């Protein structure tokens, strides 16, 4: 199945409170495999997974370095962005980026991205082709001409097409179990009394791994996701998650309602009724 | 393994 290895970078200037906070987080798929923090006691790239243990002290040191570079590397950006917009010092700002790629079973490269986010609104980014850049505002204009008149596109393109990939593989080589493991959600339902001879039926799902899941309520073979009630998935806070949904149904009319839990770690979707 | 980003 498709897989990824994206990198999340963020530098936020805290004028006065010192030098900007900078840190990058590594994600092979949606698991956190490595991060680095400026406000760290001992700044150093840190292994956010047992298996990352198989990576040498050299690896750490290496990226450790590479990081610190990018550290002051972004420090610059900040100034530069500031100048470009005509805004004087003072307002703490946040630069963020997502650089990454996506290989799929055959190893072919599905997608490569590098996107610059300034203070929360799209700055610039490398198009699908991996050759041009797209930017908003007369300012971000100045920036493209730069990255292009320097080869950036190309050099970037190599990382994505070659580096992130060769590595993404390696990571998977050793992270497998941890990344390929499953945990079947545990569901149940609840009856919540309510005025006007009606009750709230809530379908609980929790203890499941892979964070993607779908829940649905039915009344004899018909979807009710419509006037239903949902909650963004809850990090169960222990390598697993939680999610529920519910709907109002006349009292007594419970037995006629059914919830469905479809989750990739389930041979047969889960089916509950009251 | 990460990139060596450029300025702006």
């Amino acid at each position, epitope marked *: 199945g498709p897989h990824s290895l994206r990198y999340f970078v963020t530098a936020v200037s805290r004028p006065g409170l010192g030098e900007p906070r900078y840190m990058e987080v590594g994600y092979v798929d949606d698991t956190e495999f490595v991060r680095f923090d400026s406000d760290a006691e001992n700044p150093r790239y840190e292994p956010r997974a047992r298996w990352m243990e198989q990576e*040498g002290p*050299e*690896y750490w040191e*290496r990226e450790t*370095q*590479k990081a610190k*570079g*990018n550290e*002051q*590397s972004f*420090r*610059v950006d900040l*100034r*530069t962005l500031l100048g470009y917009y005509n805004q004087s010092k003072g307002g703490s700002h946040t630069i963020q980026v997502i650089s990454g790629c996506e290989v799929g079973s055959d190893g072919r490269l599905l997608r490569g991205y590098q996107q610059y986010a300034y203070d929360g609104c799209d700055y610039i980014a490398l198009n699908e082709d991996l050759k041009t850049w797209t930017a908003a505002d007369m300012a971000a204009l100045i920036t493209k001409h*730069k990255w292009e*008149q*320097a*080869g*950036e596109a*190309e*050099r970037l393109r*190599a*990382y994505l*097409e*070659g*580096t992130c990939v*060769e590595w993404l593989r390696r990571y998977l080589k050793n992270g497998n179990a941890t990344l390929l493991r499953t945990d079947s959600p545990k569901a149940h339902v609840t009856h919540h009394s309510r005025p006007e001879d009606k009750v709230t039926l809530r379908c609980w799902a929790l203890g499941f791994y892979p964070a993607d899941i779908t829940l649905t309520w039915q009344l004899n073979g018909e979807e009710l996701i419509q006037d239903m009630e949902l909650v963004e998935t809850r990090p169960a806070g222990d390598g697993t998650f939680q999610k529920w949904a519910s709907v109002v149904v006349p009292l007594g009319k419970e037995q006629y309602y059914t919830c469905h839990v479809y989750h990739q770690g389930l041979p047969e979707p889960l089916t509950l009724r009251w | *393994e990460q990139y*060596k980003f*450029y*300025s702006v």
Partner: T-cell receptor
Amino acid sequence: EAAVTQSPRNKVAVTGGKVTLSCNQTNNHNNMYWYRQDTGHGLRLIHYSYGAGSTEKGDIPDGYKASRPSQENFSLILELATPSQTSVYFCASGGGGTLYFGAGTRLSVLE
Amino acid sequence: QSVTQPDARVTVSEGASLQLRCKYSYSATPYLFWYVQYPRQGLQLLLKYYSGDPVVQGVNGFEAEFSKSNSSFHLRKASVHWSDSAVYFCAVSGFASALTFGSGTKVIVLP
């Protein structure tokens, strides 16, 4: 175009002399440098920047200092000059690793 | 972070094939390069290897082949031509926008 103007290109200076070499560019390359061409060691990195203000140490730091005022003017500065700092100095602009070097400078400080 | 041009001097008969050794140490895919320097002017780039095809085709019959097993980015041009007599340097880009050059190799092609 993209010129790496490196001046002066030569100087005979005295020991304990403060000598500054400047490098003007037109490559718009944020990354500027100062390397030193000497036999048995080839070239070596003195100092490097990422844009006005950004300044850090290379591998050959002792005695050398540097300034980054414009997205253009970079400059390796030697105050406590000693002949050990005798060599062909080279600076350069660069995006990721496409270093554009300059004409050079024959640095001859004497006793 | 390490580079090595075992031989800093090699003389060859014009016409003939030329292969300048180069080794490097860094447990990862560095950014390797090769610059040319002839009389007085500074450095000149021949090519660059970031990632991708181990065999790079560059300016003036110059090409190289990257390799792992035990490191290398040996330069290559088969039909050497006098004017090529010079100093060819091999650089790497380790922990950020730097260019850790190695000693170097002065080649001489007798006509």
